[PDB]
């Protein structure tokens, strides 16, 4: 996937997935209004990753 | 591939082409890793922003090709997919993290001078080769450039292109973009100071990033073409999926779903 | 069995034939050097 | 098959063994036998 | 090597490095001739005026190297010596006559793409290749410049250097040095009147002078960098141990 | 070994080995005392090799 | 020999070359006096100031040579030394008096057309011959000039050199050097105004000064090249050891032990 | 041995053996130091040798 | 006779025994009288 070429356009408002707006890449968790991206990119869960899976020993 | 050259017959016997049945089109590149398994980048099969959600019954695996269009009558073998496994932690949001997938073939392929698997990095090989400065080779039928003059066709190479690129140091990949860069990705490309240049591009995605071990003369796959900003852009760098880190999973699926 | 890779990484047209493709050496030279 | 020891001596695996020639190699060969 | 260029990866698999244990220092060059036998110049081991007489335990041999300093991990091969064999009639007092010596390795080094033995000459080939004009090849990690106390240079090379030098007719060698020359020696180098220039220098001693026989595309060792006056000086030539003439001895220490 | 660079200078007197005296090179058996090399070389080597044999 | 000439093949069958093993070099000359006994000068084996002090196992004896350098294959014989007897009164300290020595070969040398012993002089052949004016012959492969020039000529000779020198009158010998003379020595060489010149030189030491008795045509060894001032200097004369005198010692030690 | 030439270099002072000084020969004892020597050598003697002891056979 | 063994010394087999005269020889003989 190649960003920057407007191939993945952000929906007006809070982009739910990382994408490009004007020419800037709005990280998941921001809202862009035309040529401008404002927000606080800190999603994708706040809880750290862990291991579990059905590998019962 | 941007700023490349035509590949030699059989110089990349692992290169696989993901073809869409209807409408006929090149979806992505891929790498043969065994006789019944093909490694590729998950985003090719699943990307909601592009309404992407393929079923194994929607793709054809073309192995041993060279011409991007010619039906290599007795050279290329075409296999159908039996099943697809996209990494369960595929983070197509936020940063395309763990962009990796495995496709099983309904029938094992018969290797040849044109059909041969690439090795997955072991550990020593990984630690030895993956370093700022060492070069890797990417191969693909993807767009020849970002954008060009219409007339001829704005792009689309006639024969598999190939380009060698150096591994760039983590801080640099990180400073080259604002997308949260994880440990499961690395970047490759020439720094603006080097007059040499080149990069993967749309359609090369899924293609391997192979390196040749001096310690044993064998070709190992270090990365998978994942994402980047434009193609061959001054300052930006293309990021490849750090195969060796996902190796644990690759093995797991393979072992429980086959051998 | 299926997965084995006993010959993985060894191109039939090149490695098996003591023949290198044009750019092959460029990788080797990127390694043993350090610039 | 016989002889004694390293019969394949002097044949470099990265050049002769693969039909490659180092840049200045030609320079040597010319002095030995050149055209006119 | 004065006026040389960095050698290509693996363009000289016989090149050996004589490394002193402590202090760590590069002593001489050498060349692999059999899986366990190395060849080097006698003065690299025994030269009294410099308090040099290296016991078979004072040195180390690093085979298959390209970089001088760095430790090429799974590429180079560091081997220990079992015994040093210096030529009997080695005359270090007069002109380093018979400046030849062999060193036996504790264990036969497995050959790789970077490690391969050179072929010793034979009467035929030797007589066909050793002629004034014909060029030879010198290789080593020694001084890039004579480095006079004023001429600011970098001194030590980073990577192995290689240079091609023409063999010079006996009388010109004879006529250039005040030191007595013998049949066990031959000189090479560019005459002042020519354009190209180059020569071996301190640190390259022991390095092999090789030529490629166009009769079977193989590299034959014709000489060993022995002595000379200064480095790359106008008119002076470098002298090399005439390997072929000593083949009898080289063979004698082995034979069967 | 390379002469001419004062790396192998010899003491005053019967130079027991070819050396670099002042700027000139002295030969075995010759002699020098800073201001030039004076004396006649030995020689060794010139003498054709031999090995005493019988049975 | 300064001012000499190439010798004829076999004209001095007792001329021996004292050769050094390692390094290879010419040490001195000597004379075969028997099938196993060689006579030489003491200083060629012992002389502290130059650090010379050899052992039988470090020297070689090349008998029947001609060319100074070439290994004369089927012609010469090269023997090893068993024991070296030096005179217990070798005065290397101040006089170079009794400068004489004998070496015993490990095995006798088979005589041939090129190897034959010289005769030692008797109490009267000595008396009749050792007389001022009588000429003797000195041979050796030593230097051609005191200090020779290279390039347009060389210095060391190619083939054995021969020269005839007249025995000089005692008083003149004495008045020619500062070095005290003794009865155990005699000097030879032409006087300045005589015109003819010649003299042994470095590398000729240990060489025999022989003469031919008109009484029987035999070649007797009267003197041994010992010391001198320079080479061919106008005014100096070479000093040779008086063999006939030390003979009493030689014959004694020839019975050995 | 040949004097006058300088092959037998002389030690400054003492001169344990008849050596070659600058050029003039200096007999045992006559201490040399380039510019000739004491002029007076010695030891020395004038009595005629004689035999009066057993040491030979 | 006595002496110390074999009496054949001083006789060059290449000259004396063959009744030959080496160049310089004649000069030594003349020195025994001529001069006075």
G23: cis peptide before it, omega within 30°? Answer: yes
**How many beta-carbon pairs below 8 A join chains C and E?**
15
Query: What torsion do the CA atoms of G103, G107, G112, G117 make, to the nearest 10 degrees?
Result: 30
> Catalytic annotation on B99?
yes
Does residue B144 contact residue B243 with C-beta atoms inside 8 Å? no
In terms of Cβ atoms closer than 10 Å to its own Cβ (0-12, 13-18, 19+), residue H49 is exposed
- Host domain of residue C28: 9-35
Report the residue count for chain E. 256
Residue with tokens 């024969």: B159
> Catalytic annotation on B112?
no
Distance CA G32, CA G114 (A): 12
B–A contact: 3+ Cβ pairs < 8 A: yes
Does residue G117 contact residue G33 with C-beta atoms inside 8 Å? yes
We report the CATH number of the domain holding residue C13 as 4.10.140.10
What's CA H47's distance to the chain center, in Å?
Answer: 19
Bridge partners of G18, per DSSP, are: G28, G61
User: Which CATH number does the domain A8-40 belong to among 2.70.10.10, 3.40.50.300, 3.30.390.50, 3.40.50.970?
Assistant: 2.70.10.10
Report the residue count for chain B. 259
Identify the chains in contact with A, defined as 3+ C-beta pairs within 8 A: B
Does residue E140 contact residue E29 with C-beta atoms inside 8 Å? yes
Mapped onto helix, strand or coil, the DSSP state of residue E252 is helix
User: B13-117+245-258: which CATH architecture?
Assistant: Beta Barrel (2.40)
Cα dihedral across residues G49, G55, G59, G62: positive or negative = positive
Does residue B14 contact residue B198 with C-beta atoms inside 8 Å? no
- The counts of H helices and E strands in chain F are 0, 6
Mapped onto helix, strand or coil, the DSSP state of residue E117 is coil
Into how many domains does chain C fold?
A: 1
Does residue G130 contact residue G186 with C-beta atoms inside 8 Å? yes
Contacts of G134 in chain I (CB under 8 A): 28, 31-32
> Catalytic annotation on E99?
yes
Q: Would you state the structure tokens that stand for residue G53, as one six-digit string?
A: 């002090």
Q: Where are the domains of chain E?
A: 1-12+118-244, 13-117+245-256
Distance CA F41, CA F31 (A): 9
Q: Would you state the structure tokens that stand for residue B166, as one six-digit string?
A: 């150096």
Distance CA C2, CA B259 (A): 7
Does residue B178 contact residue A25 with C-beta atoms inside 8 Å? yes
Which strand (E) or helix (H) includes residue E30? strand E25-34
Distance CA A4, CA B39 (A): 26
Distance CA B107, CA G129 (A): 120
Distance CA D29, CA D24 (A): 9
Chain F interface mutation, best of E91, E178, E231, E249, highest count of F Cβ atoms under 10 Å: E178
What's CA E173's distance to the chain center, in Å?
Answer: 18
Catalytic entry in G31, G43, G176, G226 = G43
> What angle (nearest 5°) sits at the alpha carbon of residue E141, between those of residues E138 and E145?
85
Measured from the Cβ of residue A40, the count of other Cβ atoms closer than 10 Å reads 8
Distance CA G45, CA F44 (A): 19
Bridge partners of E67, per DSSP, are: E159
Task: Give the contacts of G118 (CB within 8 A, at least 6 positions apart).
Answer: G14, G31, G32, G33, G208, G210, G219, G220, G221, I9, I10
Distance CA E148, CA G10 (A): 57
I4: cis peptide before it, omega within 30°? Answer: no
- Per-residue b/e over G160-195, b at no fewer than 16 CB within 10 Å? bbbbbbbbbeeeebeebbebbbeebbbbbbbbeeee
Mapped onto helix, strand or coil, the DSSP state of residue E197 is coil
For chain G, the three-class secondary structure string (H helix, E strand, C coil) is CECCEECCCCCCCCEEEEEECCCCEEEEEEEECCCCEEEECHHHCEEHHHCEECCHHHEEEEECCCECCCCCCCCCEEEEEEEEEECCCCECCCCCECCCEEEEECCCCCCCCCCCCCECCCCCHHHHHCCCCCEEEEEECCCCCCCCCCCCCCCCCCECEEEEEEECCHHHHHCCCCCCCCCCEEEECCCHHHCCCCECCCCCCCCEEEEECCCCCCEEEEEEEEEEECCCCECECEEEEEHHHHHHHHHHHHCCC
Cα dihedral across residues B196, B201, B204, B209: positive or negative = positive
E–D contact: 3+ Cβ pairs < 8 A: yes
Chain D interface mutation, best of C15, C16, C20, highest count of D Cβ atoms under 10 Å: C20
For G81, list phi and psi in degrees, rounded to 5.
Answer: -90, 140
**What does chain B look like in DSSP terms, one character per residue?**
-BS-EEPPTTS-TTEEEEEETTTTEEEEEEEE-SSSEEEE-GGGTEEGGGTEE--GGGEEEEES--BSSS--TTT-EEEEEEEEEE-TT-BTTTT-BT--EEEEESSPPPP-SS--PPBPP-SHHHHHH-STT-EEEEEE-S-SSSS--HHHHS---SB-EEEEEEEEPHHHHHHT-SS---TTEEEE---TTSS---B--TT-TT-EEEEE-TTTS-EEEEEEEEEEESSS-TT--EEEEEHHHHHHHHHHHHHHTT-
Does residue B1 contact residue B162 with C-beta atoms inside 8 Å? yes
Task: Give the contacts of E150 (CB within 8 A, at least 6 positions apart).
Answer: none
Closest partner residue to C29 (CB to CB) among E9, E67, E72 is E9
Residue with tokens 């000499």: G4
Q: Would you state the structure tokens that stand for residue E162, as one six-digit string?
A: 């290689």
Identify the chains in contact with D, defined as 3+ C-beta pairs within 8 A: C, E
Closest partner residue to I11 (CB to CB) among G9, G116, G133 is G116
Does residue B224 contact residue B240 with C-beta atoms inside 8 Å? yes
CA distance from start to end of chain F: 42
Closest CA to B76 of B9, B27, B20: B9
Residue with tokens 């990690």: E141
Query: For residue H9, what is the DSSP state?
Result: B
B144 touches chain C (CB under 8 A): no
Task: Give the contacts of B10 (CB within 8 A, at least 6 positions apart).
Answer: B113, B114, C11, C12, C13, C14
On the CB side of I17, CA atoms within 13 Å amount to: 14
Closest CA to B251 of B139, B117, B85: B85
Mapped onto helix, strand or coil, the DSSP state of residue E128 is helix
User: E13-117+245-256: which CATH architecture?
Assistant: Beta Barrel (2.40)
State the method: X-ray
Task: Give the contacts of D13 (CB within 8 A, at least 6 positions apart).
Answer: E10, E13, E111, E112, E113, E116
Residue with tokens 């180098």: E189
Q: Do A2 and B227 touch (CB under 8 A)?
A: yes
Give the residue ranges of DSSP H helices in I1-36.
Answer: 25-30
Contacts of G43 in chain H (CB under 8 A): 1
Q: Provide the phi-psi class of F4: left if phi over 0, else alpha when psi is between -120 and 50, else beta.
A: left
In terms of Cβ atoms closer than 10 Å to its own Cβ (0-12, 13-18, 19+), residue B38 is buried
Closest CA to B14 of B137, B197, B146, B190: B137
Fold matches, B1-12+118-244 and B13-117+245-258: yes
Closest partner residue to I29 (CB to CB) among G166, G214, G218 is G214
Does residue E149 contact residue E155 with C-beta atoms inside 8 Å? no
Q: Would you state the structure tokens that stand for residue E199, as one six-digit string?
A: 């020569």
Does residue E26 contact residue E179 with C-beta atoms inside 8 Å? no
Distance CA G133, CA G166 (A): 5
**What does E68-80 look like in DSSP terms, one character per residue?**
SSS--TTT-EEE-
Cα dihedral across residues E102, E104, E108, E112: positive or negative = negative
Does residue E139 contact residue E162 with C-beta atoms inside 8 Å? yes
Does residue E38 contact residue E31 with C-beta atoms inside 8 Å? yes
Q: Provide the phi-psi class of G13: left if phi over 0, else alpha when psi is between -120 and 50, else beta.
A: alpha
Question: What CATH number does the domain located at G13-117+245-257 have?
Answer: 2.40.10.10
**What does B180-220 look like in DSSP terms, one character per residue?**
---TTEEEE---TTSS---B--TT-TT-EEEEE-TTTS-EE
CATH 2.40.10.10 fits E1-12+118-244, yes or no: yes
Mapped onto helix, strand or coil, the DSSP state of residue E62 is strand
Q: Would you state the structure tokens that stand for residue F51, as one six-digit string?
A: 């090995």
Distance CA G226, CA B137 (A): 86
Task: Give the contacts of A23 (CB within 8 A, at least 6 positions apart).
Answer: A4, A6, A35
- The counts of H helices and E strands in chain E are 3, 16
Contacts of G23 in chain E (CB under 8 A): 91, 93-94
């Amino acid at each position: 996937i190649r960003f920057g070429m407007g191939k993945v356009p952000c929906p007006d408002g809070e982009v739910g997935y990382t994408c490009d707006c004007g020419e800037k890449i709005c990280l998941y968790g921001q809202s862009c209004n035309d040529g401008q991206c404002s927000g606080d990119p800190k999603p994708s869960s706040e809880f750290e990753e862990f291991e579990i899976d059905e590998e019962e020993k | 591939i941007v700023e490349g050259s035509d590949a030699e017959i059989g110089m990349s016997p692992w290169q696989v082409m993901l073809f869409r049945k209807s409408p006929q089109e090149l979806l992505c590149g891929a790498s043969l890793i065994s006789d019944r398994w093909v490694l590729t980048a998950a985003h090719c099969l699943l990307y909601p922003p592009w309404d992407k959600n393929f079923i194994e019954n929607d793709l054809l695996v073309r192995i041993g090709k060279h011409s991007r269009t010619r039906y290599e009558r007795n050279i290329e073998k075409i296999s159908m997919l039996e099943k697809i496994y996209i990494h369960p932690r595929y983070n197509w949001r936020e940063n395309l993290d763990r962009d990796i997938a495995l496709m099983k073939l309904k029938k094992p392929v018969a290797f040849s001078d044109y059909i041969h698997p690439v090795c997955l990095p072991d550990r020593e090989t990984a630690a030895s080769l993956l370093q700022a400065g060492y070069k890797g080779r990417v191969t693909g039928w993807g767009n020849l450039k970002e954008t060009w003059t219409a007339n001829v066709g704005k792009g689309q190479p006639s024969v598999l292109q190939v380009v060698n690129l150096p591994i760039v140091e983590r801080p640099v990949c990180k400073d080259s973009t604002r997308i949260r860069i994880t440990d499961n990705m690395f970047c490759a490309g020439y720094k603006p100071d080097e007059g040499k240049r080149g990069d993967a591009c749309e359609g090369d995605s899924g293609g391997p990033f192979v390196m040749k071990s001096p310690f044993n003369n064998r070709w190992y796959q270090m990365g998978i073409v994942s994402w980047g900003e434009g193609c061959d852009r001054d300052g930006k760098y293309g990021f490849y999926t750090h195969v060796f880190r996902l190796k644990k999973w690759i093995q797991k699926v393979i072992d429980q779903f086959g051998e | 069995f299926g997965s084995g890779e006993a010959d993985c990484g060894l191109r039939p047209l090149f490695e098996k034939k003591s023949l290198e493709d044009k750019t092959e050496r460029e990788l080797l030279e990127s390694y043993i050097d350090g610039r």
